Amino acid sequence: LFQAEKDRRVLQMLRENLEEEAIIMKDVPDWKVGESVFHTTRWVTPMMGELYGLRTNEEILSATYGFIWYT
């Protein structure tokens, strides 16, 4: 169950980021929205900056250091 929820959450955050990129990059000339940086078509686990790049600093700080700092 946790695996299913994790997959669904990661996919949702990636789609939200993709839609916002589509909005933001509308006037960049050589941009291609949602372009991979890898030659392979294999699925690659996203970074932390992929998921929390456009979000607020509080939840970035949580996702980065919450477990380390929780004592």
Partner 1 sequence: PGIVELPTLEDLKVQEVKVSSSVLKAAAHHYGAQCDKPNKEFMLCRWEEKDPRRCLEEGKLVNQCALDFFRQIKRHCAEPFTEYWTCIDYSGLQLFRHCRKQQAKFDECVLDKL
Partner 2 sequence: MTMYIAFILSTIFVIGFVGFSSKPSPIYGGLGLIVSGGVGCGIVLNFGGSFLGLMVFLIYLGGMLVVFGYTTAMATGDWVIYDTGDSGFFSEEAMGIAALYSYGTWLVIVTGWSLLIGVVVIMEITRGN
Partner 3 sequence: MWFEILPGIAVMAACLFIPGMATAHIHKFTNGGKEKRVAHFSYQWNLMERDRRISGVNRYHVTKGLENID
Binding flag, residue 70, ligand PEE (CB under 6 A): yes
Residue 5 contact among partner 2, partner 3, ligand PEE, none, beta carbon within 5 to 8 Å by kind: partner 3
Classify residue 60 as exposed, middle or buried by CB count within 10 Å of its CB (0-12, 13-18, 19+): middle
Of 5, 27, 30, 35, the one binding partner 3 (CB under 8 A) is 5
- Identify whether the C-beta of residue 38 lies closer than 8 Å to the C-beta of residue 50: no
How many residues make contact with partner 3 (CB under 8 A)? Answer: 5
User: Taking a C-beta distance cutoff of 8 angstroms, is the pair 22, 33 a contact?
Assistant: yes
End-to-end CA distance of the chain, in Å? 27
* Interface with ligand PEE (CB under 6 A): 67-71
Which residues of the shown chain bind partner 2 in the complex (CB under 8 A)? Answer: 10, 45-49, 51, 53, 57, 60-61, 64-65, 68
